[PDB]
Write an enzyme that holds these catalytic residues in place. Structure first.
Site, PDB file in Angstrom:
ATOM      1  N   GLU A  24       0.827  -1.198   0.000  1.00 39.55           N
ATOM      2  CA  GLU A  24       0.000   0.000   0.000  1.00 39.55           C
ATOM      3  C   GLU A  24       0.866   1.255   0.000  1.00 39.55           C
ATOM      4  O   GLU A  24       1.979   1.272   0.541  1.00 39.55           O
ATOM      5  CB  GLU A  24      -0.898   0.028   1.228  1.00 39.55           C
ATOM      6  CG  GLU A  24      -2.195  -0.712   1.087  1.00 39.55           C
ATOM      7  CD  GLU A  24      -2.970  -0.671   2.379  1.00 39.55           C
ATOM      8  OE1 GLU A  24      -2.341  -0.854   3.444  1.00 39.55           O
ATOM      9  OE2 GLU A  24      -4.194  -0.436   2.335  1.00 39.55           O
ATOM     10  N   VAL A  25       0.323   2.328  -0.570  1.00 42.31           N
ATOM     11  CA  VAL A  25       1.044   3.581  -0.730  1.00 42.31           C
ATOM     12  C   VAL A  25       0.229   4.689  -0.089  1.00 42.31           C
ATOM     13  O   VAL A  25      -0.990   4.768  -0.281  1.00 42.31           O
ATOM     14  CB  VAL A  25       1.319   3.902  -2.210  1.00 42.31           C
ATOM     15  CG1 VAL A  25       2.164   5.185  -2.328  1.00 42.31           C
ATOM     16  CG2 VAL A  25       1.963   2.700  -2.911  1.00 42.31           C
ATOM     17  N   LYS A  40       5.463   4.089   0.313  1.00 46.87           N
ATOM     18  CA  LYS A  40       5.065   2.716   0.044  1.00 46.87           C
ATOM     19  C   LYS A  40       5.527   1.831   1.196  1.00 46.87           C
ATOM     20  O   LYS A  40       6.692   1.894   1.608  1.00 46.87           O
ATOM     21  CB  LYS A  40       5.644   2.206  -1.273  1.00 46.87           C
ATOM     22  CG  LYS A  40       5.303   0.737  -1.528  1.00 46.87           C
ATOM     23  CD  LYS A  40       5.858   0.270  -2.866  1.00 46.87           C
ATOM     24  CE  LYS A  40       5.106   0.887  -4.045  1.00 46.87           C
ATOM     25  NZ  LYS A  40       5.552   0.334  -5.368  1.00 46.87           N
ATOM     26  N   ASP A 131       7.613  -0.375 -18.400  1.00 46.60           N
ATOM     27  CA  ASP A 131       6.174  -0.353 -18.161  1.00 46.60           C
ATOM     28  C   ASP A 131       5.603   1.039 -18.444  1.00 46.60           C
ATOM     29  O   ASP A 131       4.910   1.636 -17.616  1.00 46.60           O
ATOM     30  CB  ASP A 131       5.852  -0.818 -16.739  1.00 46.60           C
ATOM     31  CG  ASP A 131       4.409  -1.299 -16.590  1.00 46.60           C
ATOM     32  OD1 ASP A 131       3.725  -1.550 -17.609  1.00 46.60           O
ATOM     33  OD2 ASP A 131       3.957  -1.434 -15.438  1.00 46.60           O
TER      34      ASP A 131
HETATM   35  C1  LIG Z   1      -0.386  10.341  -6.868  1.00 48.25           C
HETATM   36  N1  LIG Z   1       0.941  10.810  -6.524  1.00 48.25           N
HETATM   37  C2  LIG Z   1       1.964   9.977  -6.301  1.00 48.25           C
HETATM   38  N2  LIG Z   1       3.171  10.537  -6.133  1.00 48.25           N
HETATM   39  C3  LIG Z   1       4.189   9.691  -5.936  1.00 48.25           C
HETATM   40  C4  LIG Z   1       4.032   8.303  -5.901  1.00 48.25           C
HETATM   41  C5  LIG Z   1       5.069   7.327  -5.730  1.00 48.25           C
HETATM   42  C6  LIG Z   1       4.810   5.997  -5.704  1.00 48.25           C
HETATM   43  C7  LIG Z   1       5.884   4.977  -5.587  1.00 48.25           C
HETATM   44  C8  LIG Z   1       6.135   4.113  -6.652  1.00 48.25           C
HETATM   45  C9  LIG Z   1       7.097   3.126  -6.548  1.00 48.25           C
HETATM   46  C10 LIG Z   1       7.859   2.976  -5.391  1.00 48.25           C
HETATM   47  C11 LIG Z   1       8.895   1.927  -5.282  1.00 48.25           C
HETATM   48  N3  LIG Z   1       8.453   0.660  -5.387  1.00 48.25           N
HETATM   49  C12 LIG Z   1       9.340  -0.348  -5.337  1.00 48.25           C
HETATM   50  C13 LIG Z   1       8.780  -1.739  -5.377  1.00 48.25           C
HETATM   51  C14 LIG Z   1      10.707  -0.111  -5.201  1.00 48.25           C
HETATM   52  C15 LIG Z   1      11.166   1.188  -5.086  1.00 48.25           C
HETATM   53  C16 LIG Z   1      10.252   2.216  -5.112  1.00 48.25           C
HETATM   54  F1  LIG Z   1      10.678   3.484  -4.928  1.00 48.25           F
HETATM   55  C17 LIG Z   1       7.610   3.846  -4.328  1.00 48.25           C
HETATM   56  C18 LIG Z   1       6.630   4.814  -4.423  1.00 48.25           C
HETATM   57 CL1  LIG Z   1       6.298   5.787  -3.024  1.00 48.25          CL
HETATM   58  C19 LIG Z   1       3.441   5.527  -5.822  1.00 48.25           C
HETATM   59  O1  LIG Z   1       3.129   4.352  -5.675  1.00 48.25           O
HETATM   60  N4  LIG Z   1       2.454   6.475  -6.036  1.00 48.25           N
HETATM   61  C20 LIG Z   1       1.104   5.973  -6.314  1.00 48.25           C
HETATM   62  C21 LIG Z   1       1.070   5.203  -7.621  1.00 48.25           C
HETATM   63  O2  LIG Z   1       1.142   6.056  -8.742  1.00 48.25           O
HETATM   64  C22 LIG Z   1       1.301   5.311  -9.959  1.00 48.25           C
HETATM   65  C23 LIG Z   1       0.219   4.243 -10.101  1.00 48.25           C
HETATM   66  N5  LIG Z   1       0.563   3.327 -11.188  1.00 48.25           N
HETATM   67  C24 LIG Z   1       0.020   3.469  -8.799  1.00 48.25           C
HETATM   68  O3  LIG Z   1      -0.043   4.348  -7.671  1.00 48.25           O
HETATM   69  C25 LIG Z   1       2.712   7.841  -6.076  1.00 48.25           C
HETATM   70  N6  LIG Z   1       1.673   8.662  -6.281  1.00 48.25           N
END
Ligand SMILES: CNc1ncc2cc(-c3ccc(-c4nc(C)ccc4F)cc3Cl)c(=O)n(C[C@H]3OC[C@H](N)CO3)c2n1
Length: 264
Positions: A24-25, A40, A131
């Site tokens: 979850e994020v 995350k 992706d």
């Molecule tokens: C709406 N604004 C918003 N700003 C930033 C984010 C950043 C992420 C995200 C992404 C990846 C990882 C990560 N993961 C792994 C396994 C390794 C290293 C990593 F650094 C960590 C994070 Cl914190 C994030 O999920 N989201 C929400 C996300 O958006 C795109 C959609 N496809 C799904 O939901 C976000 N949203």
């Protein structure tokens, strides 16, 4: 990573901004700067076989220093849970911004141009995103456009050679599919079962953009979506594509699209 510090002290965890890769994020606050972050949280007891993929994406994100790639701040281990901290992008994803209605070709070209700037950076650094899709394109509240959710080293955006088992030209294909998604709302074959799409993509001729869209945009899509990867142009070349040059405008204009999604 960081096994010493306590992330629940360093960050205030707020509302969930959806599920994501492996956990979850959450929106959150960096308690020292009060900047907004995305957090995350991955339960490492609940994901044995996925840990290597998690680290692989951590490594790649930490090697990126670009305005067009979401900033990575670091990770922390608290008991069984790995906290991963990124910058928060308040405009949401390009996919979200499709909800109120169709994009116009200026908005499409502007988003495509910023994506191309990200792919040019990554490919010049000998990286592949893997992706590219509208759900993985994030906007800041000021309309800046950034890439996120790198794929690991659902089929609709995959290039045929990826499915058959590739280089950076696979990102160009996914960009073509993403161009259709931004014009039409969904990728080709979106009504079909994913396992049918798995043999459709290599079997069929490449998708075309269908509808009352400009010819440069249809040619941009066709240029990306060639079955033969060497016939696909580089991201550098597509930045000079007439669709882009004639239609893209300042990113700050995209705040109108973000405000629209808020009024919807
Ligand atoms: C709406 N604004 C918003 N700003 C930033 C984010 C950043 C992420 C995200 C992404 C990846 C990882 C990560 N993961 C792994 C396994 C390794 C290293 C990593 F650094 C960590 C994070 Cl914190 C994030 O999920 N989201 C929400 C996300 O958006 C795109 C959609 N496809 C799904 O939901 C976000 N949203």
């Amino acid at each position: 990573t960081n096994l010493k510090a306590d992330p629940e002290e360093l960050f205030t965890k707020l509302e969930k901004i959806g599920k994501g890769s492996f956990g979850e994020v959450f929106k959150g606050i960096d308690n020292r700067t009060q900047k907004v972050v995305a957090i995350k949280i991955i339960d490492l007891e609940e994901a044995e076989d996925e840990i290597e993929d998690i680290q692989q994406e951590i490594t790649v994100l930490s090697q990126c220093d670009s305005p067009y790639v979401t900033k990575y701040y670091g990770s922390y281990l608290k008991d069984t849970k790995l906290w991963i901290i990124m910058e928060y992008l308040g405009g949401g994803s390009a996919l979200d911004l499709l909800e109120p209605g169709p994009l116009d070709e200026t908005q499409i070209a502007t988003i495509l141009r910023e994506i191309l700037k990200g792919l040019d950076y990554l490919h010049s650094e000998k990286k592949i995103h893997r992706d590219i899709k509208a759900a993985n394109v994030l906007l800041s509240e000021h309309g800046e456009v950034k890439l996120a959710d790198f794929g690991v080293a659902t089929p609709f955006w995959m290039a045929p050679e990826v499915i058959k088992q590739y280089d950076s030209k696979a990102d160009i294909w996914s960009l073509g599919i993403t161009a259709i998604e931004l014009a039409r709302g969904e990728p080709p074959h979106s009504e079909l079962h994913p396992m049918k799409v798995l043999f459709l993509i290599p079997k069929n001729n490449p998708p075309t953009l269908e509808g009352n869209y400009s010819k440069p945009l249809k040619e941009f899509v066709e240029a990306c979506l060639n079955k033969e990867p060497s016939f696909r142009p580089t991201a550098k070349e597509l930045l000079k594509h007439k669709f882009i040059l004639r239609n893209a405008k300042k990113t700050s204009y995209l705040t109108e699209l973000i405000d629209a999604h808020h009024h919807h």
